[PDB]
């Protein structure tokens, strides 16, 4: 399945995933690409923040869907 990942950009790069792929994995894809910690990356789809332990077949993520993945800072 193809999903478009957008990192604070205008466009989105297509990533080939599967039905059991977890959000964590999709995050790591961007993590290794931008050199940014996966624990600081968040995924937003349709105005909804996707939970790390969620999988493709467990959300409204379908073929040719676009997602917004960005580094969400935390102040603690």
């Amino acid at each position: 399945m193809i999903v478009f990942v957008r990192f604070n950009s205008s466009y989105g790069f297509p990533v080939e995933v599967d039905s059991d792929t977890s959000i964590f994995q999709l995050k790591e894809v961007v993590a290794k690409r931008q050199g940014v910690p996966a624990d600081q990356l968040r995924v937003i789809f349709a105005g909804k923040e996707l939970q790390n332990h969620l999988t493709v077949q467990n959300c409204d993520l379908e073929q040719q869907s676009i997602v917004h993945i960005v580094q969400r800072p935390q102040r603690k």
């Binding site: 105005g47 909804k48 923040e49 917004h68 960005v70 580094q71 969400r72 800072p73 935390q74 102040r75």
Partner: protein, 62 residues
């Protein structure tokens, strides 16, 4: 005239001082904390929020 930002996404405050807002909300941007945290006011509430979570209508004087 007043620098304002458009909430492109939903931001829920999980920490103390974070400014919560919903998608489509207009926040009164007033200051910048760092390269990722923005400071503004919404409905009287003041706090900070991520820069990559909003859109810039009017840019800051630079």
């Amino acid at each position: 005239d007043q620098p304002c930002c458009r909430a492109l996404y939903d931001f829920e405050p999980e920490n103390e001082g974070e400014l919560g807002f919903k998608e489509g909300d207009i926040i009164t941007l007033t200051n910048q904390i760092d390269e990722n945290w923005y400071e503004g006011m919404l409905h009287g509430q003041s706090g900070f929020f991520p820069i990559n979570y909003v859109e810039i209508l009017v840019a800051l004087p630079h």
